Each structure stands twice: as C-alpha cells, then as structure tokens.
Amino acid sequence: GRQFGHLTRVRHVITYSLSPFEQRAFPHYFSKGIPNVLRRTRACILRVAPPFVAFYLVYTWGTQEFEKSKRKNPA
Amino acid sequence: DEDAVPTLSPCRFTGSQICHREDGLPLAHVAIAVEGPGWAHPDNVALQVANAIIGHYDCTYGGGAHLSSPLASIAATNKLCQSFQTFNICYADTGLLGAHFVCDHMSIDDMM
C-alpha cells in the first residue's frame, strides 16, 4: 500500500531543484567532504569506540593468560 | 541618443523545478516547458503546428472521447484533468515551449 498523493497533508513548503545534467555529482568532494567525515567521526567515537577497545583488551589479555598458563616452573 | 543605450543580453535557460506544495488548494497546477527559440527563428511555425495537434482541453468542451488530440481525448474519457493548454512563449533569443494543466491531486502523474 500507501501510493503517492495519499501519504500525508503538507502546507506552504517550496522546493527548488536543479536538473542532474546541470550540476556536478561531486561538488566540493574533498573540500567540504573530508571535514564532514571528521565531524561524524567525532560525534560518534565516544559511543562506538570504547565497547570495542574493552573487547580489544579482553582479547589480548585473554590470549596471554592462556598461552602463559601452559608452562610452569617448580612443583 | 548617444551613450547610455545598451542592448539586451541573452538569458540562460536552466531547466529545473520549483514545487510549491499546498494541500489546502483543491486542484494542482503544473507548467512544464523546454527552452524554445526566440521570435525571429523560422521554426516557430512547426512548433505551433505540433502544439496545435496536441491542442487544448477544458472540462466544458463538447465532444469528449471523440476529440482528435489523443491527450485531449484520453483526458476527457478517463477525466485526468480539468483543463490543459500547450504554449509556445517567445522572447528575444529564447522561449518556453510546453504545456500547462490543472487537475485533481491523484491525476498529476497520469496527466504528465
């Protein structure tokens, strides 16, 4: 279902567009582009990054104890 | 006369779209056109012939289904519009060539 023309009620909103054959597909790509990816990364690190490093650490520690355990000095 | 008498610069045609969504009004208006040549150009006659074939329609024309123009005919039978008109507007070295129509919210697509 749903169609077009029966979605919802909208009032007083103009939308200017420009034909794809009259604009560039990659405007300020490196110029405006890269700062944006840096900004998105900033916004998300503190929520994505930590959980992972918690595993990263659990992983290397987990392996060391294992490997180091199958060895022994006296008794 | 003398200095301070400039000519007319050409006007770039762009080709884009402006939509003014307003569901409060009961019938949609749409106007679509390609760039036409100016007044001078000889090929305005052929454009007008082609436009005449497509013609115009309005909901008070007698003769519906039997109208020659296929757009007119299909518009009247399936009631895909309330009115439509082709145009060939002319300016110095450019122009708007195309059509305009008016219709219920659910007929804009078929009409186009």
Curated annotation (Swiss-Prot), chain A:
Residues exposed to the Mitochondrial matrix side: 1-38
Any Pfam family matching the protein: UcrQ
Residues bearing PTM N6-succinyllysine: 32
Spans traversing the lipid bilayer: 39-67
Keyword Oxidoreductase belongs to the record: no
Entry GO terms, CC: mitochondrial inner membrane; respiratory chain complex III
Membrane topology: Single-pass membrane protein
One BP annotation, GO: pons development
Domain of life according to the entry: Eukaryota
Keywords, sorted A to Z: Acetylation, Electron transport, Membrane, Mitochondrion, Mitochondrion inner membrane, Respiratory chain, Transmembrane, Transmembrane helix, Transport
S-adenosyl-L-methionine keyword on record: no
Localization annotation: Mitochondrion inner membrane
InterPro entries: Cyt_bc1_su8, Cyt_bc1_su8_sf
Residues with the N6-acetyllysine modification: 32
Gene3D superfamilies linked: Cytochrome b-c1 complex subunit 8 (1.20.5.210)
Physiological role: Component of the ubiquinol-cytochrome c oxidoreductase, a multisubunit transmembrane complex that is part of the mitochondrial electron transport chain which drives oxidative phosphorylation.
Family to which the UniProt record says this protein belongs: Belongs to the UQCRQ/QCR8 family.
Assembly, per entry: Component of the ubiquinol-cytochrome c oxidoreductase (cytochrome b-c1 complex, complex III, CIII), a multisubunit enzyme composed of 11 subunits. The complex is composed of 3 respiratory subunits cytochrome b, cytochrome c1 and Rieske protein UQCRFS1, 2 core protein subunits UQCRC1/QCR1 and UQCRC2/QCR2, and 6 low-molecular weight protein subunits UQCRH/QCR6, UQCRB/QCR7, UQCRQ/QCR8, UQCR10/QCR9, UQCR11/QCR10 and subunit 9, the cleavage product of Rieske protein UQCRFS1.
Name this protein carries in UniProt: Cytochrome b-c1 complex subunit 8
Organism listed in the record: Bos taurus (Bovine)
UniProtKB/Swiss-Prot annotation, chain B:
Organism, scientific name: Bos taurus (Bovine)
Subunit structure comment from the entry: Component of the ubiquinol-cytochrome c oxidoreductase (cytochrome b-c1 complex, complex III, CIII), a multisubunit enzyme composed of 11 subunits. The complex is composed of 3 respiratory subunits cytochrome b, cytochrome c1 and Rieske protein UQCRFS1, 2 core protein subunits UQCRC1/QCR1 and UQCRC2/QCR2, and 6 low-molecular weight protein subunits UQCRH/QCR6, UQCRB/QCR7, UQCRQ/QCR8, UQCR10/QCR9, UQCR11/QCR10 and subunit 9, the cleavage product of Rieske protein UQCRFS1.
Full-protein residues shown: 258 to 369 of 480
Subcellular location per the Swiss-Prot or TrEMBL entry: Mitochondrion inner membrane
Family: Belongs to the peptidase M16 family. UQCRC1/QCR1 subfamily.
Function: Component of the ubiquinol-cytochrome c oxidoreductase, a multisubunit transmembrane complex that is part of the mitochondrial electron transport chain which drives oxidative phosphorylation.
Protein name (record): Cytochrome b-c1 complex subunit 1, mitochondrial
